[PDB]
Coordinates of N, CA and C in Angstrom, one line a residue:
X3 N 87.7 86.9 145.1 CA 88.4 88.1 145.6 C 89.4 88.6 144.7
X4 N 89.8 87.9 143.4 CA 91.7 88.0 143.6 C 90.3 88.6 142.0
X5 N 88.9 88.2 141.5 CA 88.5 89.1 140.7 C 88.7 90.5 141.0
X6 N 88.2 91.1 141.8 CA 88.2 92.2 142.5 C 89.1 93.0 142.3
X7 N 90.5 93.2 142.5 CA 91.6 93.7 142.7 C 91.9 93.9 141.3
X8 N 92.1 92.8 141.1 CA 92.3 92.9 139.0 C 91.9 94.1 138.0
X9 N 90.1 94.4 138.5 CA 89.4 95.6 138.2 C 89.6 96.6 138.5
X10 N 90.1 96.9 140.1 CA 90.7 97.8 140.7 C 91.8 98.2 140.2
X11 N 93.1 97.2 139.9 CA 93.9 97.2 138.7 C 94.0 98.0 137.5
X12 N 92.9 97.2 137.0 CA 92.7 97.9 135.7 C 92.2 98.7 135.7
X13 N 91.2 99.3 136.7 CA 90.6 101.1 137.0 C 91.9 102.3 137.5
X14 N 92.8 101.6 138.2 CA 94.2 102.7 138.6 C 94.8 102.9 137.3
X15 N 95.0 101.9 136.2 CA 95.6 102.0 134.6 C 94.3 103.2 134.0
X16 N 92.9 102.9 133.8 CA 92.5 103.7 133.3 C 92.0 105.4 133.3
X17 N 92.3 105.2 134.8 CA 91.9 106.8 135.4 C 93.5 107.4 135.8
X18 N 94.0 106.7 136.2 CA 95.4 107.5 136.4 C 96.2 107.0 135.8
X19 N 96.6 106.0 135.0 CA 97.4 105.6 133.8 C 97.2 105.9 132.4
X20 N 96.0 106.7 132.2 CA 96.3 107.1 130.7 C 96.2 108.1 130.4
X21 N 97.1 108.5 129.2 CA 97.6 109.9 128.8 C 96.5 110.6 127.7
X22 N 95.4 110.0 127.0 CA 94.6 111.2 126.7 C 93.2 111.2 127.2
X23 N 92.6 112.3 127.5 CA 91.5 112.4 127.8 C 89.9 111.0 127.5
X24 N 89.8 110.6 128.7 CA 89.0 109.7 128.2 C 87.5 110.2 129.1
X25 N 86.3 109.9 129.1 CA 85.2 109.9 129.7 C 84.4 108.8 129.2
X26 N 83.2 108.8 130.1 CA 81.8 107.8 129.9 C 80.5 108.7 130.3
X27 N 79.4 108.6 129.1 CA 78.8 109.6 130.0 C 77.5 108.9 129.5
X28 N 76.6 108.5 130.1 CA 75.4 107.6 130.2 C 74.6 108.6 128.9
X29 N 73.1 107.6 128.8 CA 72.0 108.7 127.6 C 71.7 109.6 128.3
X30 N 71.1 110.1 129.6 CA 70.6 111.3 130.3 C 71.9 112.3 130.4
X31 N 72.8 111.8 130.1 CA 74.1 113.2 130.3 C 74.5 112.9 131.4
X32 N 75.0 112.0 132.4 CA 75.7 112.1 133.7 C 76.6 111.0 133.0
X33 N 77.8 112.2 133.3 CA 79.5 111.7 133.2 C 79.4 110.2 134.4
X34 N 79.9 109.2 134.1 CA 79.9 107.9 134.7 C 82.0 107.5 135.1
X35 N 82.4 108.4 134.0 CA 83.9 107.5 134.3 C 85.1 109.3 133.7
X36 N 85.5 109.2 134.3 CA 86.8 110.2 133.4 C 88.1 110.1 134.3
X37 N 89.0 110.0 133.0 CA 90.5 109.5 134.0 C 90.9 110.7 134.1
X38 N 92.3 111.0 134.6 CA 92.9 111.8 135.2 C 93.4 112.8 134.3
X39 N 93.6 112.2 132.6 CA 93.3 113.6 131.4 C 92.6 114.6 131.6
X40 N 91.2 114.0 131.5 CA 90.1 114.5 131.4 C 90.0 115.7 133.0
X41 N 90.6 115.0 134.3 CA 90.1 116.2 135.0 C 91.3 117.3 135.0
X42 N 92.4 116.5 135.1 CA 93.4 117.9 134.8 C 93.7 119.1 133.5
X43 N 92.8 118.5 132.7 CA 92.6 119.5 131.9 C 92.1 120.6 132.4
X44 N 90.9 120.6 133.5 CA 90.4 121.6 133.8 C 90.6 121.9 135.2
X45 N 91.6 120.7 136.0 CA 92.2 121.7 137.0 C 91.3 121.1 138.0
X46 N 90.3 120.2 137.8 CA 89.2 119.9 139.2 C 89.4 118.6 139.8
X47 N 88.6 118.1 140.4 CA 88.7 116.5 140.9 C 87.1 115.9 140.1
X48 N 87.4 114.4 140.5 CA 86.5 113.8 140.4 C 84.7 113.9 140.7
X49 N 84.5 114.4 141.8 CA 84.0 114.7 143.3 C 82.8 115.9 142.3
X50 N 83.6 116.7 141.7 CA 82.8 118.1 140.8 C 82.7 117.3 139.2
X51 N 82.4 116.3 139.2 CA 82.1 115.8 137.4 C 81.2 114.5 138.0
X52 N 81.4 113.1 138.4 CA 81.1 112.1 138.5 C 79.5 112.7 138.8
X53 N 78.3 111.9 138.0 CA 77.4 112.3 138.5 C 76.6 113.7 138.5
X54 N 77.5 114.0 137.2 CA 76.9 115.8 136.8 C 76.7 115.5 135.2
X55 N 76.1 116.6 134.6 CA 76.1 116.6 133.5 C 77.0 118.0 132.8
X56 N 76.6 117.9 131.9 CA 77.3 118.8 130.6 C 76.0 119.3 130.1
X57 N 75.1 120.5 130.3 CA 74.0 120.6 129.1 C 74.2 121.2 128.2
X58 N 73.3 120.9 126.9 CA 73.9 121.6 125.4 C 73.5 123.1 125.7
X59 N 72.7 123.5 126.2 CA 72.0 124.8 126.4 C 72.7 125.7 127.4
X60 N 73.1 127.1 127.3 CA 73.5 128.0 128.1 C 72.6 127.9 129.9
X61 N 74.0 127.7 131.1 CA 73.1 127.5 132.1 C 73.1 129.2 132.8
X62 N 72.6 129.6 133.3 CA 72.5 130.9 134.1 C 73.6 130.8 134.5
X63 N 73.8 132.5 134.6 CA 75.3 133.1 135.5 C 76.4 132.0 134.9
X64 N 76.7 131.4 133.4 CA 77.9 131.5 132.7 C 79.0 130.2 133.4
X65 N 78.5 129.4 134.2 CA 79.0 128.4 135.1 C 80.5 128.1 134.1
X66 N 81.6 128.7 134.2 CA 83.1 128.2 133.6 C 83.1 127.0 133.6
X67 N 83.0 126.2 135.0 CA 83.6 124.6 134.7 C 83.0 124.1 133.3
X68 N 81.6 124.0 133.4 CA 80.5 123.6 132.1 C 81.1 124.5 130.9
X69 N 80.9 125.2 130.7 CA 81.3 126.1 129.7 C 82.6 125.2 129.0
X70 N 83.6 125.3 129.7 CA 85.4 124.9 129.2 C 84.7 123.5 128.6
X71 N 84.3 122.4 129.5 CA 84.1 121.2 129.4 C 83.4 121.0 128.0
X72 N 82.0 121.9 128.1 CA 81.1 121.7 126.6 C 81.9 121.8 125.1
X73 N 83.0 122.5 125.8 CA 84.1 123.1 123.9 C 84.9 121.5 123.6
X74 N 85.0 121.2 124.6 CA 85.3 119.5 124.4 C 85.0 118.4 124.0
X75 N 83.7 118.2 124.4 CA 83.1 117.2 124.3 C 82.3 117.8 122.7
X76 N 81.4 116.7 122.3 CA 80.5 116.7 121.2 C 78.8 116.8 121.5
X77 N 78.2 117.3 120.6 CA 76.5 117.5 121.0 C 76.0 116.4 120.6
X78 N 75.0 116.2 121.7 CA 74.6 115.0 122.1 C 73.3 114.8 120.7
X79 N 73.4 113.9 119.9 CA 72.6 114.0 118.6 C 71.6 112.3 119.1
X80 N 70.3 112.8 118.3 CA 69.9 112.2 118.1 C 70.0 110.9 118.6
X81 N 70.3 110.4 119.5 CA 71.1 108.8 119.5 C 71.3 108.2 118.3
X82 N 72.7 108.7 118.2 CA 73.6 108.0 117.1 C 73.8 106.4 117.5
X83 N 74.0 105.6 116.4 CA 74.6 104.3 116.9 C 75.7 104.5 115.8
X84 N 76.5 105.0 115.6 CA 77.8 105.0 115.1 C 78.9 106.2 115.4
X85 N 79.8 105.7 115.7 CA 81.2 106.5 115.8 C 81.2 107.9 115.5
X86 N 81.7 108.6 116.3 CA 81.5 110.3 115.6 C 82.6 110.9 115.7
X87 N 83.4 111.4 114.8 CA 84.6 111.8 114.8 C 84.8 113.9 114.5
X88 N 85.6 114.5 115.2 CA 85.6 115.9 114.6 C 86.9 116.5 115.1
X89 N 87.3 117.8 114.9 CA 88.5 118.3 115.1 C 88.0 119.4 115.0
X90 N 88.7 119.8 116.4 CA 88.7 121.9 116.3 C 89.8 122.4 117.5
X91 N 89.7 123.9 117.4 CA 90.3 124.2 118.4 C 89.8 124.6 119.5
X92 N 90.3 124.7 120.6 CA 89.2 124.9 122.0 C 90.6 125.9 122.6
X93 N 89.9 127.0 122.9 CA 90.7 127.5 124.3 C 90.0 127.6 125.3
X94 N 91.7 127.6 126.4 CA 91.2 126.9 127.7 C 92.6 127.7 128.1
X95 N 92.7 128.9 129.7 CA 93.3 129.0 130.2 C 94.5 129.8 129.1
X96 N 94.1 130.4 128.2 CA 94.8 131.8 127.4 C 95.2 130.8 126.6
X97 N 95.3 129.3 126.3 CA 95.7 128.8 125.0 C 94.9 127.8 124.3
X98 N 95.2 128.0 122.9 CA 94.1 127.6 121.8 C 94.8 126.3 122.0
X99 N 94.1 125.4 121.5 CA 94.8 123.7 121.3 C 93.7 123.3 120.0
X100 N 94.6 122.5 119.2 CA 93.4 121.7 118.1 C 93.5 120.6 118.9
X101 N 92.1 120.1 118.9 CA 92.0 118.6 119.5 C 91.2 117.9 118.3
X102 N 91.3 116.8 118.7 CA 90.4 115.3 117.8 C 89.4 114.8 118.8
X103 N 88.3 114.9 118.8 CA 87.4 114.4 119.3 C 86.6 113.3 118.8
X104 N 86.2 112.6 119.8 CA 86.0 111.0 119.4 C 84.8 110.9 120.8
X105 N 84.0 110.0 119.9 CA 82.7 109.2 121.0 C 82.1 107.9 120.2
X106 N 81.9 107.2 121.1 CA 81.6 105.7 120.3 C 80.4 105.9 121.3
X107 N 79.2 105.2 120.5 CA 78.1 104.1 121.4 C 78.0 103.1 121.9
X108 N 77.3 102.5 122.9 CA 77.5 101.4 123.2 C 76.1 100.7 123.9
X109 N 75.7 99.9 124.3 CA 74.6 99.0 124.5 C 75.0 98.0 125.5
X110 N 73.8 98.2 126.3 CA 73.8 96.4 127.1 C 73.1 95.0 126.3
X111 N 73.8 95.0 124.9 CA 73.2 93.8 124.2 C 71.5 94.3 124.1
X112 N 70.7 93.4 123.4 CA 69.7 93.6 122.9 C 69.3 95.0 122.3
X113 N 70.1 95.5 121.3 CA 69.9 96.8 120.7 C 69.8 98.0 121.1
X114 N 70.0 98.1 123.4 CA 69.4 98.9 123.5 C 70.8 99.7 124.1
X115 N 70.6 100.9 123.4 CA 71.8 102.1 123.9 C 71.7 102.7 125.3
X116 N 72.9 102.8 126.2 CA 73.2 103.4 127.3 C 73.7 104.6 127.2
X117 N 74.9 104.8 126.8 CA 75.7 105.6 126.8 C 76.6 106.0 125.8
X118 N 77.6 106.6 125.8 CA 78.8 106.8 125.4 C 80.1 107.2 125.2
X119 N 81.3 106.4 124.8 CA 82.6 106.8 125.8 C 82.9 107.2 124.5
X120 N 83.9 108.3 124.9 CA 84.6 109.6 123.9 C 86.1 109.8 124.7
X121 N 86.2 111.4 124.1 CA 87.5 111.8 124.7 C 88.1 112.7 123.5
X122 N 89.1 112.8 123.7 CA 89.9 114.1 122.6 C 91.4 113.6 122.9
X123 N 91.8 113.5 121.9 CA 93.6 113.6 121.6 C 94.1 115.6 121.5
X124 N 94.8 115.6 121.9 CA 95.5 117.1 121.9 C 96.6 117.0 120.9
X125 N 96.1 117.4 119.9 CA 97.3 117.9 118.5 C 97.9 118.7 118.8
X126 N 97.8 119.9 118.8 CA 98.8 121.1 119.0 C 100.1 120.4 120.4
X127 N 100.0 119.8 121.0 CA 100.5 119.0 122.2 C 101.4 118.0 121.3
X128 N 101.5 117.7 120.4 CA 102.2 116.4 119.6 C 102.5 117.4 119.0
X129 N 101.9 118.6 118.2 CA 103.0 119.6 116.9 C 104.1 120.1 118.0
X130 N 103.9 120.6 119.3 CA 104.8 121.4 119.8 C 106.1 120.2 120.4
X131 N 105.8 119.2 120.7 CA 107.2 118.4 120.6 C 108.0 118.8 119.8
X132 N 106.8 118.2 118.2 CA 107.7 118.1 116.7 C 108.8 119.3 116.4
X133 N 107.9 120.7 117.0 CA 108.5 121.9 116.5 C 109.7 121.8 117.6
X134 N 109.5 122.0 119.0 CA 110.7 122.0 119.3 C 111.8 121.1 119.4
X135 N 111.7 120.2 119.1 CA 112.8 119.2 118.1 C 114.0 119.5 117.3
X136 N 112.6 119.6 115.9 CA 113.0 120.1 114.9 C 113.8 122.1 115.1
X137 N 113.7 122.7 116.2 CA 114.0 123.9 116.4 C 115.5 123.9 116.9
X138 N 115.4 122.6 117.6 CA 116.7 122.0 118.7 C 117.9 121.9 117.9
X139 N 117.6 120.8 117.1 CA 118.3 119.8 115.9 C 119.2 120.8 115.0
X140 N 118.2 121.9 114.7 CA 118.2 122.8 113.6 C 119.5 123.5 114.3
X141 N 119.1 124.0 115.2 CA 120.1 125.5 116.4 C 121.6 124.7 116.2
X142 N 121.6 123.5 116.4 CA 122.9 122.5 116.6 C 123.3 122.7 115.1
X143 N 123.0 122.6 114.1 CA 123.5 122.8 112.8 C 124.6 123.6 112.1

């Protein structure tokens, strides 16, 4: 039992305790995990992602939630078995952000691939501290 809770534990740390966008999203494309970055970026709940996908292909009538979400995430290649790393900017809600985008693979042992967990760090989000800091510091001068 006292396993149990511990997980639970550690699932309140990963979905509502961490500060950059994280997801899991199986080989068929259904999102399996995303913490509380990942939905408030776009403003939704859990409820409208868990159990949906992201497709690479334009869906009819322009679906926004998908749309925002695809500038995020990475195209789903070939089954990679290695780390994939990239940087761009995405706008969302009238502002541009550079992000770092990141996805690892992973396997249930025996060579054979499931899925895999990604996410994005927000750069422009760490310059704009730096700048208003350094704008603060400066004014005081």
């Amino acid at each position: 039992e006292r396993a149990l809770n511990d997980q639970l534990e550690f699932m309140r740390v990963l979905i509502d305790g961490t500060p950059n966008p994280i997801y899991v999203r199986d080989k068929e494309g259904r999102m399996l995990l995303c913490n509380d970055a990942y939905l408030d970026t776009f403003g939704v709940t859990a409820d409208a992602v868990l159990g949906k996908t992201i497709p690479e292909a334009n869906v009819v009538g322009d679906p926004a939630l998908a749309r925002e979400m695809h500038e995020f995430l990475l195209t789903r290649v070939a089954a990679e078995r290695e780390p994939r790393f990239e940087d761009r900017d995405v706008t969302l809600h009238g502002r541009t952000r550079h992000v770092y985008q990141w996805t690892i693979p992973y396997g249930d042992s025996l060579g054979e691939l499931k899925g895999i967990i990604g996410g994005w760090i927000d750069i422009t989000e760490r310059a704009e501290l730096l700048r208003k800091l350094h704008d603060l510091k400066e004014s005081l001068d």
